[PDB]
Design a protein around this ligand. Structure first.
Ligand SMILES: COc1ccc([C@H]2CNC(=O)C2)cc1OC1CCCC1
Ligand SMILES: COc1ccc([C@H]2CNC(=O)C2)cc1OC1CCCC1
Ligand SMILES: COc1ccc([C@H]2CNC(=O)C2)cc1OC1CCCC1
Ligand SMILES: COc1ccc([C@H]2CNC(=O)C2)cc1OC1CCCC1
Ligand SMILES: [Zn+2]
Ligand SMILES: [Zn+2]
Ligand SMILES: [Zn+2]
Ligand SMILES: [Zn+2]
Ligand SMILES: [Zn+2]
Ligand SMILES: [Zn+2]
Ligand SMILES: [Zn+2]
Ligand SMILES: [Zn+2]
Lengths: 334, 327, 334, 327
């Protein structure tokens, strides 16, 4: 029954931080500390209230919080990058992207709910290792998902499964039609987060930009499920790949975390007598170069395309990415 | 005794299109998949090539066959034996002579044998609509096909059932990836794509100085195997009318049963599952015209003219059913 | 199945057979036939209405029918004995046992609900082979349940799991308290149907009958949970082992079905080179002898003890058992 | 290597009851389970005896230890290492010399190693109340223990992890049964009877020629093994005070975190899990008085007098905590 979803006497400082919920560059780490490591629960609660999703979908308030806490409890606290903080961050970034001027009134509430819920569960119960590692070891997960998008299929199943715990079904008052539509979009979005799908996603996105249509209002025209879900997929995907576009201070912390996680896998791999995966070798690591390359061949190409689709709404995000790209470049030891 | 002699006579057509699979099922005490698989395995000296202890092969086959539903009219062990035998025939076609390795041959055959294991008699969509545990587990995507794979492989783990116990790590690794690629291709929701990309291949077709089809990379190799097994799965209409008619009676019984269940549950009845407003004859012609014939005609172009006789039996059965529609 | 609010031919016939639902010896096989192979759904529905369980527990009728059909759909039609007709039989039998005068007003509606629900799901998804066969073949079911009460654990897991399919949660309106109590009782009852528990289960029933206490009206007195659940467990165990107490005409059909199922397992075991389980070899079977043994060592000792518990309430039932015993005895070919 | 020596030195106590398991955890890069298990397996020549390839042993150990949650304060790889090492010491109790076969010894050490694998840091009742997937799968009965067994055995199926590959079908069947019997008995709800039967076995106690414990039937042999591992799992209070207080701090951190989770959810806060109404000291004394002491009193009363030093340490530790009880 508390103000932001959880109990905390630093509630005033947290309240002040959550004022930036609609802003790119939210101090998600401070919010994580101030909420007692409940960034996903408080940030989702704030966004649901802000968007009036509880009333619109008849979600009892206690059910929402029980589910959110349950969901957050299933992200691993010992995983440096793919944890609840990353989940909270993607949820909040997706929230900002959905509010872009070029997309106003374009998506329905159910579609908005789907993008946000998808963002919240997109990495749930991530072991801290890649699909390839899960595949090489013949893990039960790899076997159940026939080696195809193992982690991603797993994130979805868990997200939906938790809905079944006590007082966790936040979709209990949606009609069958709403639940099927929602479920489909969510699945379509989370499966798209698998990096092995990046190129085809980006390709289709560019195509859409090439044939970009806008209504009498200055907003994007999306006439069919295919184009709609495609935008939602690239949106969430952009949010999942938005670290380099945040204020350097936040970006650098994500870099330290993604590397700390990659090195754990690297170590675990050499212990098991496996070939150390790329960028997972703390002994042969070029953190800076790696980040620059990540931007040059992945992040910038994606955000440059998204920027065109919603031009000029994302111009500042793109400028920050470039400023950050140059910082790391200047950090590469020679 | 008399039983063995009759069954052995029938097993003699194992390499021919039109095997009396229904007779074999009867005579083998309902073990058509086990007897036909073992038959084919010896016929291809597969037990020797991959050093598969015989007792282990029979144990696994009976196990796999046991996980096919006896109460399911169409998607049962007979269908499985049929797709296995049919793929066995397509593998021996002239244009593919000496093309595939013993390992790839094993994969297409294994894939065929498990492609529908533990089939419940209802479609993916029915399992999705009812929120089945299976659908939730595979996120509504190729639900049954993913399950067929999982069961097929998991069954290798039962007592004295690992028929790949002697294959090397590299072999197992390669087999697993091909079977997954093959079975997942059986999902009809992926028919249009397979057929479209199969035609694209026939247009860039490349025959070697041996008159045999040339397949360089894995992508080309697998696509042919996926389509081969896909044609085998969709071969009922190209078989002798005697068999084809039985397959039709069986699939309709299964579809009608799904419709009765949907009617029970108040769900909307699926197309061709309403026993009160059905047109079996008409549906069969439509199935051949928009799906079966379009596909088998493409396969004919790839192995021209190896499948000419199959393609003619289809057009023939097509007419038989057409001249059956009342007025 | 009806037509214009007025019943159809078969339904009427089914309705007239269902009038003996409160009687020992219902023509359950005729009902299976008349109901289009839906004996479990029709009998469960008849009983829920008779005991007013839908109003008492606010179960929407459509939800109940949907779950019942779903539950019945998970019993294997290709299994001769452990199928939906058996489930229906144990349900109707438990139902008759609950109405014994010696137990009037003893149990609450929740306990009555648990006894009935447990009966309905007690053998769901039975594969037609024993626990030992699943253990010796290293089935995944055996692995999942660590070879302990494999099938009984599975029956339970499936029975509860089905409540989660579309519009199948018949307990959606019970409070958490009612659900946790119902669930514990159902679990305790079903796990007790494992024959390996028979001896200890019977020992405690006798012990209870030894210390039997009545309210000078015949009405048994069950204070604590330990005695209440024990009686319920034994009740459903009796229903499960009630075939030998039904009119011979019914009993013989059950005997033919169990033998068919046992012989099939033997066939599979002989195929697989496994040793043939007791009474599973069709080439060396003593059907009449086996039934005699089954009655003398298991069924008669159980029912005689139950006869004592509710005496004289089960005198007729015991009389039928002994008569069927003699009949089978005189049938043994010398 | 500078530390490799220190670690190797610390390992000179692998056979001593009081090993600084925490030190081994640090010096080994947090691989106390893999390290202790390897040392002990060689210590007993288990590798050669059962023909267990070193690779497969280390790979499974790392794979097993990796499924222990590093975020959990008490039920983690360190606790697992401690229980393996402890069971190891007890197995060497003179009153048991030559009593157990190598397969029975492997069974008790393996069980120990996986007895808490994949523990989420919350109790069975917490999983039951929340309607967790695990509880629904295991029907609220020994939920976690069933899970610990499942994961322990399943991890043998991963890449080069099956350490029991070279065992006959008879060995494997017996090992599996024994392990299951041991881990399932670690469920505290099984405590009262497990102790009851242990006492009875001590009354009718009987020794052989050498004067070593006489265990005829499986029932008795497994009962001794079940209780042995149970004592190892309930051995914290019997270790030197320094180690004991570390464990106490650890269980309490875990318990309070559950209480915090129960409180966030408006759930009833479980006994001793409320950091606002805690009696850490009084609870340790109650734990020793009503559970740990009666248990160890009987064990030492079965391996008389090998566990005398242990029992006395326990009693000393109890008094220390008792003096820390406010009021
Ligand atoms: C903070 O930077 C990164 C931020 C986010 C990611 C996600 C994309 N794929 C993943 O597995 C995680 C990778 C990053 O760095 C990668 C680029 C170079 C090395 C790792
Ligand atoms: C030979 O009959 C058929 C045999 C096999 C199939 C497979 C294709 N999809 C399935 O689910 C099974 C369809 C048939 O015809 C059906 C299509 C229209 C009516 C029946
Ligand atoms: C009425 O027949 C029987 C009906 C029901 C059972 C249950 C008890 N155990 C089971 O596996 C099923 C046994 C029967 O008789 C058996 C005893 C000897 C041969 C078959
Ligand atoms: C070192 O202390 C303890 C050590 C070990 C345990 C086992 C018993 N249950 C578990 O989950 C672990 C309890 C302890 O103390 C408890 C007793 C009273 C409060 C906590
Ligand atoms: Zn991800
Ligand atoms: Zn992510
Ligand atoms: Zn299929
Ligand atoms: Zn098929
Ligand atoms: Zn049963
Ligand atoms: Zn039964
Ligand atoms: Zn434990
Ligand atoms: Zn433990």
């Amino acid at each position: 029954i508390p103000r932001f979803g959880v109990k905390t006497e630093q509630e005033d400082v947290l309240a002040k931080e959550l004022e930036d919920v609609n802003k790119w560059g939210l101090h998600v780490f401070r919010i994580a500390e101030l909420s007692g490591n409940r960034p996903l629960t408080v940030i989702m609660h704030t966004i649901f209230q802000e968007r009036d999703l509880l009333k619109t979908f008849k979600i009892p308030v206690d059910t929402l919080i029980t589910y959110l806490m349950t969901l957050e409890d299933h992200y691993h606290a010992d995983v440096a990058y793919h944890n609840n903080i990353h989940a909270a961050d993607v949820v909040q970034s997706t929230h900002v992207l959905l509010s872009t001027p070029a997309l106003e009134a374009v998506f329905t509430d159910l579609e908005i709910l789907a993008a946000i819920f998808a963002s919240a569960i997109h990495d749930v119960d991530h072991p801290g290792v890649s699909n390839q590692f899960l595949i090489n070891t013949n893990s039960e997960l790899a076997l159940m998902y026939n080696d195809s998008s193992v982690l991603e299929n797993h994130h979805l199943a868990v997200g939906f499964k938790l809905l079944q715990e006590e007082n966790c079904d936040i979709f209990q008052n949606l009609t069958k039609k709403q639940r099927q539509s929602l479920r489909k979009m969510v699945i379509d979005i989370v499966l798209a987060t698998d990096m092995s799908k990046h190129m085809n996603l980006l390709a289709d996105l560019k195509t859409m930009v090439e044939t970009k249509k806008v209504t009498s209002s200055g907003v994007l025209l999306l006439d069919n499920y295919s184009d709609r879900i495609q935008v939602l997929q690239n949106m969430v995907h952009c949010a999942d790949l938005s670290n380099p576009t945040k204020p350097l201070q936040l970006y650098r912390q994500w870099t330290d975390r993604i590397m700390e996680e990659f090195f754990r896998q690297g170590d675990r791999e050499r212990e098991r007598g496996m070939e150390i995966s790329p960028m997972c070798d703390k002994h042969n690591a070029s953190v800076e170069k790696s980040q620059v390359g990540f931007i040059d061949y992945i992040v910038h190409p994606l955000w440059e395309t998204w920027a065109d689709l919603v031009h000029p709404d994302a111009q500042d995000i793109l400028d920050t990415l470039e400023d950050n790209r140059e910082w790391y470049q200047s950090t590469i030891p020679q």
